[PDB]
Amino acid sequence: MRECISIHVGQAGVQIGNACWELYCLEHGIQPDGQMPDSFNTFFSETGAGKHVPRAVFVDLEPTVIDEVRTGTYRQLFHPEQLITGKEDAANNYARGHYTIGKEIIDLVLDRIRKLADQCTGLQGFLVFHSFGGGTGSGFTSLLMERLSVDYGKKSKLEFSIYPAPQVSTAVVEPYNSILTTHTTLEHSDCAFMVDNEAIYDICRRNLDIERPTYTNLNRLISQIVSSITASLRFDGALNVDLTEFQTNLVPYPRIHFPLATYAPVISAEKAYHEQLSVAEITNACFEPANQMVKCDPRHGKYMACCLLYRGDVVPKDVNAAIATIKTKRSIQFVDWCPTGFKVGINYQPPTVVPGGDLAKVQRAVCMLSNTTAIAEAWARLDHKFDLMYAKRAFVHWYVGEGMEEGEFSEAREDMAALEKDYEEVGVDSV
Amino acid sequence: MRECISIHVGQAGVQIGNACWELYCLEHGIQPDGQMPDSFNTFFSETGAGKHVPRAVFVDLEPTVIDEVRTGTYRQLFHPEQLITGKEDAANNYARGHYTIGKEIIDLVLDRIRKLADQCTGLQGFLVFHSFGGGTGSGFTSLLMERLSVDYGKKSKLEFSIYPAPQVSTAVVEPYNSILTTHTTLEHSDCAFMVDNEAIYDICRRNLDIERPTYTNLNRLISQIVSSITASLRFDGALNVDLTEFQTNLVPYPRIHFPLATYAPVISAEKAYHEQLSVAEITNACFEPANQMVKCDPRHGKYMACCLLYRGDVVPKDVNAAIATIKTKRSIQFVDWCPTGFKVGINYQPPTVVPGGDLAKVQRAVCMLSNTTAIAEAWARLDHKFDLMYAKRAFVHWYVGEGMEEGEFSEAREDMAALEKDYEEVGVDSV
Amino acid sequence: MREIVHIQAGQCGNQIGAKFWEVISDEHGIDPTGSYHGDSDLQLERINVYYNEAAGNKYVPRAILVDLEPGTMDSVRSGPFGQIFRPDNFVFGQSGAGNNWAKGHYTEGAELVDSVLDVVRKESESCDCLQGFQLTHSLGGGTGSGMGTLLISKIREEYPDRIMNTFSVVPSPKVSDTVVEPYNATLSVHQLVENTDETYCIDNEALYDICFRTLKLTTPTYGDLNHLVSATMSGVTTCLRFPGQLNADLRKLAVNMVPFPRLHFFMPGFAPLTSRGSQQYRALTVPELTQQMFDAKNMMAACDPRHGRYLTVAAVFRGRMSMKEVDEQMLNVQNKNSSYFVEWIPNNVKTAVCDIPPRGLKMSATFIGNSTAIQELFKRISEQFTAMFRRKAFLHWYTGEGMDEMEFTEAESNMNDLVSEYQQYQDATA
Amino acid sequence: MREIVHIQAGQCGNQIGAKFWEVISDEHGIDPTGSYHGDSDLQLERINVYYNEAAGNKYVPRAILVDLEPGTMDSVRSGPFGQIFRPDNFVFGQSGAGNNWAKGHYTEGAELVDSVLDVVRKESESCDCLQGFQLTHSLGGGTGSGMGTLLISKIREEYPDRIMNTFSVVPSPKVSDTVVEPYNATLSVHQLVENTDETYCIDNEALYDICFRTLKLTTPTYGDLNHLVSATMSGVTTCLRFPGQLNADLRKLAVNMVPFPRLHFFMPGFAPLTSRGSQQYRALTVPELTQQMFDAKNMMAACDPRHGRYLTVAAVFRGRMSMKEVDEQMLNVQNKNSSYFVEWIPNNVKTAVCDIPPRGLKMSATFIGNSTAIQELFKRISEQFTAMFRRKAFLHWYTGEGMDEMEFTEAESNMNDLVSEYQQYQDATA
Ligand SMILES: Nc1nc2c(ncn2[C@@H]2O[C@H](COP(=O)(O)OP(=O)(O)OP(=O)(O)O)[C@@H](O)[C@H]2O)c(=O)[nH]1
Ligand SMILES: Nc1nc2c(ncn2[C@@H]2O[C@H](COP(=O)(O)OP(=O)(O)OP(=O)(O)O)[C@@H](O)[C@H]2O)c(=O)[nH]1
Ligand SMILES: Nc1nc2c(ncn2[C@@H]2O[C@H](COP(=O)(O)OP(=O)(O)O)[C@@H](O)[C@H]2O)c(=O)[nH]1
Ligand SMILES: Nc1nc2c(ncn2[C@@H]2O[C@H](COP(=O)(O)OP(=O)(O)O)[C@@H](O)[C@H]2O)c(=O)[nH]1
Ligand SMILES: [Mg+2]
Ligand SMILES: [Mg+2]
């Protein structure tokens, strides 16, 4: 009665969803054969007799990644018609992923989304996994978000975008794609969480004592976060939450809907025996400056709204006491115009342990979603990188050669500068 | 031959009447089944063969107390149509208990009263038990008194109102209810005896050596007083008395009919064996300053007329000697304009010991009904409480919203001021 | 010939009348069955004075009992002599006076009076020469004072030539039984003065003293007090019912004892009153009886005889005794105590002697004194009346039944005038 | 006779109502099967108040459950007492308010309110004489504070003469679980002031303090807090369901506790709160209960009683105890703490006694206080509202559902006026 739809776009989005769905199947007990050996009605359609099929759509212009899914251990799970593939990657070109190739495939995707929407009832919202740096994850997602807002204006959209790392870089045109997609998505997406590859690398190496991390470990952490967000839907507990509640609590202004994500109890098995992992200890970890999954200094900016999603055997009295201590810290600076900045959600189901993951079993777990002004530094950095390359007009001809206009680049820059100004204005205290 | 009718209105009235009828049944030898295994004709109608029925009408807007009576040990005694219950209680709202709801039950109550009156001859008068504090016992009592005075102008009405205690109170609108009911009933009742809960509590602690007295003992004492009052109508004896004699002797002026009841021989069993309980000692006890049933200082006001209702083996010479000794007392100051202070009534029947009562068997017993001017202090205290609460129209909107104007409050206040002035005037000596 | 009817009004009136008929029946030897069983023949010689013969030799008293409440009648009807009275005589009301004189004289008494007068006429025709009416009365109450006064006025109108005697209980000086006792007393005497022919004022306070001081009683009930009054009533009429060496009569008593029409209030007294323990230590003789009769403390009225000179004194002796001894005693009393008698009356003592003594006594006497000392009693009532009337206390009850302040003011004028008359002759000098 | 219809709205409302019906069924001995299995017929003597008889001796609660999300309804259904509720009463939406008051009062609540009102009428017209409505909701949330407010307005429009009681949970001062809690609270109270007749304020911080400091608990879940609130409601309503020496009523409490129309916010309290370890040490007596009730730290509201004088205080005792001790304790409280009451109210204590104590307790008392200290909570809420509203934080969500700034300003003005009235009455003297 509260079905939610998840859409995975681009290589990074598809791979994250692959780990994400591996988590859901383990949680509810759903076998890879999709034959459960209620709660699962919020994600899986009970098609046929004795079988469940997830409400997911996988779309990628390059057929390589999705072809790996069809050959993977989860072949029989997904609906074969739900996996849509192109025949040529966007090649990190935003125009190709939005204008040239994106036009050919968008019609088929909207057909699949409408099919799922009619099948489901009481639709909650959309989950979109995509990447800023890439072209398919940026150009196609902007195209998809523009379409859905027109067709589903009354429903909320949630994104989990791979925010570009400050020092670590993979594509030379990451600043270009990120600026373009943000301008085109700022007016459509209700609330988009951002995570950095670099920040997760430090967390993986430090807390988990992992010498050589890979994307498998990184994506599993993301899966744990998205599991916590949807926990209140897939399970019942004290003080439940809904996706519509996230939009209200975490978005003071329409143009500021970029909250961070954080998972507090991230420890290895070799270190779990000694740690107490108390509610107070867990909540302290969630606010650790080095424990944020975005490479930004939280102390260099005010907090505006933080949502805590506890999991497991957690007593609300412990949460109330732990919250009070956090509010009394002098370093943790909240905006004066927001007296109460905590939206607390609790659930009874503890996190499950991935058989191959590096995370040990924990009786309690929280996920912190904080809307903070610290990202103003992050926005400035990407904005600055955009300005340097565009000054020489480098790499512009590739975009121009696929239907773009040069003036559009300035407009995206102009809007991005406005966004940075808006963050600064909000960060100012009252008089 | 000499019929009398008892009407119990409100919770306090109903419970006191229950105790009084238990006392009457014990006194006349009438079993609770109504068949006793003349004297009884003054109160019970011998309807049918071998069955007697009390001449009582129980009225209460809240059906809880009357329902408890129906399920009580006296179920098969009262006539089923004699018990009249409303649907919603007055809830301490005088307007509700007089205007809004009383109009829906007054017709049935008057019909039952007319049936009882037509079923008897030589009707002496009416006995009404009610509380000055509650809503039903005030508004319904005033309405019923007005109706009876309209329809039975030649008869006498007697009330036993539970006057509010000075320092002890239970309802916040007790001053409002008391002032309103006094204003409405001062022109209809012929003589209204009054008692205070605080004074009876003090008597129970000091004399009975009881430290946790409930309402049962208080109601039993009140029943003893009522039985002493009505003894002359039920048993032969030297110097009998009647209710008309009470009205003639105890009411010097039309608006000064507020005597104080008093029961002299109130001792416990453990203390009875050490006292002779002679007539002189009993009479002296009846005038003890700390032995009145109303929390008023008798020495602060002149007596006007005191009626003594003796019981048991009493020699009239002892009564005359005790009266002379009382008249010789300087502290007991009578009004100089009433030389014949006392009205004396004797009866052969001694008091009866309640099986579970805390009073010990006594060979002699008297009841003192004194019309003293000290009651002006209590009237002034209640008037001051009313003035303080009404000074800012507190707790007024309830009365306003039930078809009652504000000017009635002012008229009642003026009438109470006039009553206090009349008491003060009467207090003045004669030249 | 010379038959006397008996009327009882009010609770006190009926209570006294019960014992009066008990003692009369004891004197005439009539059991509660109403059948004669006595031994002396002289008892039945004049039994028609109080009784009417009936079938089967049954005798019933010529008595009428009136009340406004059935409470007293039931006790009388259930008493030892309840079956003696004819049931038709038991006339009673329902509402009751409730000590309100106006209620007992104007409202409740107005309805019941016609029935009683019908019974009065029915009883009167049963005789041939009606001697006079006898009423037992209470001034303090409402039924007695109200109805009894109203009944007196009606009878006086119907029988102007016959004498009416009232034995009214007067309120005590110190002890008061009702709050409005002064009101009822003044209203009643307003009419008793101008209507009755001989009234024997009696006070409960004096009776209590006699029971205590003389009889040495510790628990004097109302039964004993009424017995003393009853003995007095029997002594007055014993001259009619029996022969004697010097026989008087009721009319012969009124002539001697009433110098003037307005002055007929008497203070009765009984001679042989002795306690049980002192019976053997005191000699029963004429001088012993005479000393007791003139004893100041022996008067059944609360007044002090020493405070006022006697106008006339009638002593009615009973039993066989020499006239010489009786006459000498009276001469000594009038000589030794000459300061206590009016000089303008040459001889004050009227003597009546009867042969048969009371039941069980060797001899006895009855004292009836017309003393001006009773003026003190009246002025006390007037004083109490005035204090309660200046502030108009309790007047709304009387005015509510049809009375008026005019009646009260008129009543006090009659009382003050009566007090003036008593003081006039008390100060009068030859 | 005198039936009460119970309405549960919002997640907190349903969570409280589950425990409320659990404890009520425990009192009346109604098993989760819905069939009576108790041992005291007095429970069934007044079971009509909360239940309707059915075929086969079945009884069902007269409850109506309202929500905008089916999760809470499904959780309740799986509960031990899910089967006793009539399934037709379960009314629930699909979209869910999502903590947005505007959505819970204009967009989702508007569509769903018709079914709720239809069920309300069906339940009400099935009773002979309706006593009043009771609502359990939360001010902080969206569904609660919007749907309950709209339903209260509709019912007040439909039933002007009845009384509506709301046991609303107020936001805690230091610990807040929602970001738009001040907005929701102000918008809800704007109508709660003008619509409801008696509102009981509950703060989770005070409940935590009671659970830890007094009850000596270490892991207090929401079950214990909801149980405390349910026990308070049962103590409030026990006067109707059982006899007693002084039986009160909901309207009786409304008349005794509300001096002026806009001041009807109370701070309830439960007297016998002791931990398991200290069960033997404390003596259970009326003075002990009275001392616990007036304890500063034992108030379920976050306000400090010492910061303002009470207007009126109602204490509803339960069990068999002497009235003398109760009134003596009340007099002692008014004497010692005379500085904590308004001088212009002579007597401030309303006392009710019932003969049926709560299950497992010899005696108990339920506290109800109309203290002026709630102005502190109101001004704290107003300050938070102003701080958020100066920069129009989160306003676009409300304006997206049809709301406007004018309503926010009007609600803030009404709250400020209420605070001003409270302060004025706290300040004014005789
Ligand atoms: N956290 C995480 N990040 C990934 C993963 N795979 C790729 N990325 C990051 O996502 C960014 C975007 O790369 P792609 O997703 O391949 O770009 P695209 O959407 O496929 O568009 P194309 O360039 O046409 O392939 C890269 O720079 C990577 O750093 C992954 O598995 N986990
Ligand atoms: N002495 C005595 N007083 C009682 C008793 N029961 C109640 N009262 C008094 O009655 C007062 C309250 O008035 P109630 O009679 O209860 O009210 P009511 O007449 O039923 O009208 P409502 O307020 O609508 O219930 C209290 O202040 C008590 O003092 C009792 O058993 N004995
Ligand atoms: N001697 C005597 N006096 C009585 C008796 N009963 C009543 N009294 C007197 O009568 C007075 C009461 O008046 P009462 O006749 O009863 O009032 P009534 O019935 O309205 O006429 C009291 O002052 C008593 O002193 C009695 O038995 N004997
Ligand atoms: N005492 C108590 N309070 C609760 C419980 N559950 C939720 N709450 C309160 O309700 C508030 C959440 O509002 P909620 O009703 O869930 O939002 P809504 O569904 O939109 O009305 C929080 O501030 C909690 O303090 C509970 O079980 N017990
Ligand atoms: Mg790709
Ligand atoms: Mg009542």
Numbering used by the authors:
A (entry chain C), B (entry chain A): 1 to 37, 47 to 440
C (entry chain D), D (entry chain B): 1 to 430
What does the paper say about this structure?
MT-associated protein 7 (MAP7) has the unusual ability of both MT binding and activating kinesin-1-mediated cargo transport along MTs. The interaction of MAP7 with MTs is mediated by its 112 residues long MT binding domain (MTBD) (residue 59–170). Microtubules (MTs) are key components of the eukaryotic cytoskeleton and are essential for intracellular organization, organelle trafficking and mitosis. MT-associated proteins (MAPs) interact with MTs, regulate their dynamics, and mediate MT functions in physiological contexts through sophisticated regulation.
To improve the occupancy of MAP7 MTBD on the MT lattice, additional MAP7 MTBD was therefore added to MAP7 MTBD-nucleated MTs adsorbed on the grid before vitrification. Following imaging and processing of these MTs, the symmetrized 3D reconstruction of MAP7 MTBD bound MT had an overall resolution of 3.3 Å and revealed improved MAP7 MTBD density lying along the protofilament, and offset ~20 Å from its centre. α- and β-tubulin were accurately discriminated during data processing, as evidenced by the distinct appearances of their S9-S10 luminal loops. The helical nature of MAP7 MTBD is also evident from the reconstruction density, albeit at slightly lower local resolution (~4 Å) compared to the MT. Individual MAP7 MTBD side chains however, could not be discriminated in the helical density, probably due to a number of factors including sub-stoichiometric MT binding and as a result of the dynamic nature of the MT-MTBD interaction. To facilitate interpretation of our reconstruction, we used AlphaFold 2 multimer to predict the structure of MAP7 MTBD (residues 59–170) bound to a tubulin dimer. The calculated model was fit into the MAP7 MTBD-MT cryo-EM density, and flanking tubulin monomers along the full length of the MTBD were also incorporated for refinement against the electron density map. However, since the exact register of the MAP7 MTBD cannot be confirmed based on cryo-EM density alone, we truncated our MAP7 MTBD to include only its helical backbone together with 4 tubulin monomers, including the central α/β-tubulin dimer18. Additional C-terminal residues Val437-Val440 for α-tubulin and residues Ala428-Ala430 for β-tubulin were therefore also modelled guided by the density. The ordering of these usually disordered residues could be a result of an interaction between the tubulin CTTs and MAP7; however, this interaction is not directly visible in our reconstruction and is presumably not well ordered. MAP7 MTBD forms a 130 Å long helix from around residue R66 to residue E148 and binds MTs along the protofilament as confirmed by cryo-EM.
